[PDB]
Design a protein around this ligand. Structure first.
Ligand SMILES: OC[C@@H]1NCCC[C@H]1O
Ligand SMILES: [Zn+2]
Length: 994
């Protein structure tokens, strides 16, 4: 295994290093607005050194944006793929690439058998080529790496199953900036090449000047270069035809033959039909554009994309584009003075030719590490808005992520009879979650009615996972001699304290000495180690005692159920109470407990005090005390001591008894919208200067203090803010309701004396932490980065890490600060084609963990390393947000067969290892059962403080085991023990069973 801490990779282009060197001047470059006037020596080309030109037709098909998936399918995409099948069948030289497998599966299953076989023939002979072959073209900012792999797996599994092809070239022309998570996953899924488009106009210019637009993209920690993937960055403003033929859109627009009589060229020179009278002049004009594009690249092989949004819809667009281009190719190829060979081609054809040129010593490509965030398409129009837009659905993504993992893991342990409809359910759940990874899904850049479609699809997916999970738990914990399932029955309902939070959903367990004395509850632990976590349930009485199934008592706390009402004041229930206790759950296992009512206070249940600083609670045995606003200090267990202001906001953290009171102030601020010039929208973050504090007024502060759990809650305007303490890093919950505050972005900022300087760290796709440097030379919105799972600041002694349960936008705009946007309400459109602002806000419960740590005894990476690494504590805290324990309440009065535990024999793997995916790959009807596992090992900082896990042997009667691509679709290594994986490596294994 490489050291990913002490050794700094040597690369030609390191994006943090490049960003520091670059001036980012927005100078007018001429016809190429953001570059220069390209010049080539025409004696470069001759009969032995020709320019080889691949014109690759394509159609950008969004699975939701202005219209829903189904609306676009019926209006546009079904016509595009019908015409593709017809025109490619009829015209053997015509080529076409397709990215979005969600639309292609939708289309293909509706074809007659004859059309299906015609479709198969144009894929077999390389006319129609799948590029990436993901379910969608995913967002690369907000997306979790697990969901990127999920949607890739769903598309390529469909392609291999129904078309017997697996793409090895990726096409990502529309995501709003680009993550190195994509090559990481692609290169471990058999990919050889990838293409990207939406990078900062100054980055395009800088790299274009050095012909570094093609590069071997490696991970920021990768010293060896084993992660390296060949990347082609397109050089210009757009993927449309005006911006793909060459540097002058005025000329290129004339070679988009659909723009003749209801689309036109904004540069006012129309395309003209190619005739014997003009082909000589047109060819000269076009080949001059191509030869300028070729100056930006190191080989004599040129990629010329030919397409746009929902193109190749009408049969006559196929005609007009194919016939004009063929007349040009025929003229150009026959005329030796050009020294061009031009033809229709595919993306793979381009990359194959480029690598032939490389092997022949004709070019040697530079190495690159880093990311391509934050994207600007022009001037100061940075796309940091969508890091936060529609934060409700951003949170929902992380919840559905966890439920699909839990549902697939729990149901994997057994084969299911097809009458159970497990496969049906999991396929729906995976596809709705896969669809939401679209760059108009999780981004929050779709119209209101499309966001509603995504929400309803994810809601059906959640319900599907719940049904699989409850059926699975009943089977795993009911004695096999008794187990006799009704596959339509709800044996358990799920209890979730964190989603929606917002809604009054959660069921109250009703107990009574006569009516129903006791209730079985079950906790699931998807992580492959022993875990202890406080769980809570709503109960009808405060006189409840907790036992395991062996009747061993378990220490418990009962709190009141509080709600907030609109000044903003708390109200308490007189009919339901929270019972709180510590569940100990095996690795990838289940634990059963029992809640029992009594006359009065049981031996092993404590009651929390309540202090209203500025109310009956039924049979709650401790009355609510009252008082004037004042500072408070709270400690739970031997964990930290937290001090709060008189407004209920954290002011300091003391880690241990004999350590300092470290200042850490939470503060809410607001950003506004520019009155004159560019308006913030779903995409763009264009603040009118620094954020200004939110007037907190005189807010009610609720203090609950218990043996197991305490909290400080306050009703601020727009936000119920809560700090929860359970004996380690506290948990922050914001109930965010931006209500009517038009042209407002609400931000949450932390202020420390940490000596961070201009340095902060933010994660990419919850996989890796990347070093950011604040740049005063760039506007505020450019120092905003994705916060998909966490951010931190540190000096020589102290680190502060904020972990998120949801992707949001954030920065460190000054030494010792962190900030993260909560929500944004925007009256204006930002002129990127969405044609509306963001006025559909709804209450969302944001969740966080706050880890203050001393790092002076931690082995930090080189001051030159572009990566940072979490501590054990911060990593485990991210794990508690993203993959908490699942809670099951038994639906019926009695549970015969009930067992106490599943997975007590499962190995407890080292803390840095995760079984990201467990998925049974085969239905019951298959002779050999097969189960897929994705193993991810992170890298944790060593600070001076477990069994071997072999997934091949987790299920019994293993006949075979291999290392696979992460999609499980190809074997890389026949083994039957899975070897343990390196820090920052992800490996897949498929075990076969007799
Ligand atoms: O995916 C649809 C749109 N394409 C152009 C850039 C913005 C994006 O939402
Ligand atoms: Zn798009």
């Amino acid at each position: 295994c490489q050291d990913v801490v002490q050794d700094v990779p040597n690369v030609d282009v390191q994006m943090l290093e490049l960003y520091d060197r670059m001036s980012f001047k927005d100078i007018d470059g001429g016809v190429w607005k953001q570059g220069w006037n390209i010049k080539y020596d025409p004696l470069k080309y001759n009969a032995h050194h020709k320019l080889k030109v691949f014109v690759v037709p394509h159609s950008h098909n969004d699975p939701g944006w202005i219209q829903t998936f189904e609306e676009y399918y019926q209006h546009d995409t079904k016509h595009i793929l019908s015409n593709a099948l017809r025109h490619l069948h009829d015209n053997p030289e015509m080529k076409f690439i397709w990215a979005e497998i969600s639309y292609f599966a939708r289309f293909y299953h509706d074809l007659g058998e004859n059309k299906k076989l015609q479709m198969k023939s144009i894929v077999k002979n390389g006319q129609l080529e799948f590029v990436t072959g993901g379910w969608v073209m995913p967002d690369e900012a907000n997306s979790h790496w697990r969901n990127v792999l999920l949607q890739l797996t769903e598309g390529q599994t469909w392609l291999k199953q129904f078309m017997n092809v697996t793409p090895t070239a990726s096409w990502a022309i529309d995501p709003f900036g680009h993550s190195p998570t994509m090559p990481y996953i692609l290169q471990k899924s058999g990919f050889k090449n990838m293409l990207i488009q939406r990078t900062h106009y100054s980055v395009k210019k800088e790299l274009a000047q050095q012909r570094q637009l093609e590069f071997l993209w490696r991970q920021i920690w990768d010293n060896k270069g084993d992660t390296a993937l060949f990347t082609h960055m397109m050089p210009f403003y757009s993927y449309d035809i005006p911006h793909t033929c060459g540097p002058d859109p005025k000329v290129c627009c004339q070679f988009d033959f659909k723009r003749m009589g209801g689309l036109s060229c904004p540069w006012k020179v129309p395309p003209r039909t190619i005739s014997d009278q003009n082909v000589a002049a047109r060819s000269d004009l076009l080949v001059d554009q191509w030869k300028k594009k070729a100056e930006l690249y190191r080989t004599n092989v040129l990629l010329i994309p030919l397409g746009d949004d929902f193109r190749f819809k009408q049969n006559t667009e196929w005609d007009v584009q194919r016939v004009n281009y063929e007349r040009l190719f025929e003229h150009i190829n026959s005329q030796a003075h050009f020294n061009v060979q031009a033809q229709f081609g595919t993306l793979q054809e381009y990359f194959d030719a480029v690598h032939q040129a490389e092997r022949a010593g004709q070019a040697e490509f530079p190495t690159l590490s880093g990311d391509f965030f934050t994207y600007a398409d022009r001037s100061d129009n940075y796309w940091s808005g969508y890091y936060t837009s529609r934060p409700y659905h951003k949170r929902m993504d992380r919840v559905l992520m966890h439920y699909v993992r839990a549902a697939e893991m729990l149901s994997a342990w057994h084969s299911w009879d097809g009458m159970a409809r497990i496969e049906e359910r999991l396929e729906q759940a995976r596809r709705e979650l896969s669809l939401f990874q679209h760059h108009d899904g999780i981004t929050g850049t779709a119209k209101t009615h499309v966001v509603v479609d995504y929400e309803q699809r994810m809601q059906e997916a959640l319900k599907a996972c719940q049904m699989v999970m409850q059926q699975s738990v009943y089977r795993l914990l009911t004695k096999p001699s008794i187990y006799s399932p009704d596959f339509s029955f709800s044996y358990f309902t799920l209890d979730d304290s964190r989603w929606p939070g917002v809604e009054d959903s959660r069921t109250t367990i009703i107990l009574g000495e006569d009516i129903l004395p006791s209730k079985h509850v079950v906790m699931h632990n998807t992580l492959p180690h022993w875990r202890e976590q406080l769980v809570d349930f709503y109960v009808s009485s405060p006189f409840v005692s907790v036992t395991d199934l062996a009747n061993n008592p378990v220490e418990a706390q009962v709190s009141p159920v509080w709600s907030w009402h609109h000044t903003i004041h708390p109200q308490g229930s007189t009919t339901k109470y929270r019972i709180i206790f510590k569940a100990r759950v095996p690795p990838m296992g289940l634990a059963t407990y029992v809640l029992t009512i009594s006359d009065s206070k049981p031996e092993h249940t404590s009651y929390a005090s309540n202090l209203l600083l500025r109310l009956p609670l039924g049979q709650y045995p401790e009355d609510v005390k009252f008082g004037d606003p004042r500072e408070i200090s709270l400690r739970v267990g031997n964990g930290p001591t937290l001090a709060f202001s008189e407004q209920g906001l954290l002011k300091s953290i003391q880690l241990t008894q004999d350590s300092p009171h470290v200042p850490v102030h939470f503060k809410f601020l607001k950003y506004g919208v520019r009155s004159h010039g560019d308006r913030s929208g779903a995409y763009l973050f264009l603040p009118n200067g620094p954020a200004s504090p939110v007037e907190l007024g005189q807010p009610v502060v609720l203090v609950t203090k218990g043996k197991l759990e305490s909290s400080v809650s306050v009703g601020l305007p727009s936000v119920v803010h809560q700090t929860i303490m359970r004996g380690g890093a506290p948990e922050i919950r914001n109930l965010v309701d931006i209500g009517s505050l038009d042209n407002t972005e609400i931000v949450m900022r932390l202020e420390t004396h940490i000596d961070s300087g201009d340095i902060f760290y933010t994660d990419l796709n919850g996989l890796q932490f990347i070093k950011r440097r604040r740049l005063d030379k760039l506007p505020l919105q450019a120092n905003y980065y994705p916060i998909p799972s966490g951010m931190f600041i540190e000096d020589a002694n102290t680190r502060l890490t904020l972990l998120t349960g949801q992707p949001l936008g954030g920065s460190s705009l000054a030494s010792g600060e962190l900030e993260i946007m909560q929500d944004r309400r925007l009256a204006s459109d930002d002129e990127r084609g969405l044609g509306q602002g963001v006025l559909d806000n709804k209450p969302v419960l944001h969740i966080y963990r706050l880890v203050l740590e001393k790092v002076n005894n931690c082995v930090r990476p080189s001051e030159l390393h572009p990566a940072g690494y979490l501590t054990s504590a911060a990593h485990k805290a991210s794990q508690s947000l993203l993959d908490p324990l699942d809670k099951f309440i038994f639906a019926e009065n009695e549970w015969i067969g009930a067992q106490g535990q599943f997975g007590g024999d499962h190995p407890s793997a080292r803390e840095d290892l995760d079984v990201s995916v467990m998925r049974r790959l085969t239905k019951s009807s298959a002779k050999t059962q097969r189960v897929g596992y994705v193993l991810h090992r992170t890298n944790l900082m060593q600070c001076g403080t477990t069994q071997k896990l072999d997934v091949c042997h987790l299920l019994p009667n293993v006949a075979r085991c291999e290392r696979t691509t992460l999609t499980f679709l190809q074997n890389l290594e026949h083994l039957m023990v899975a070897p343990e994986v390196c820090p920052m490596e992800t490996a897949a294994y498929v075990s076969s069973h007799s």
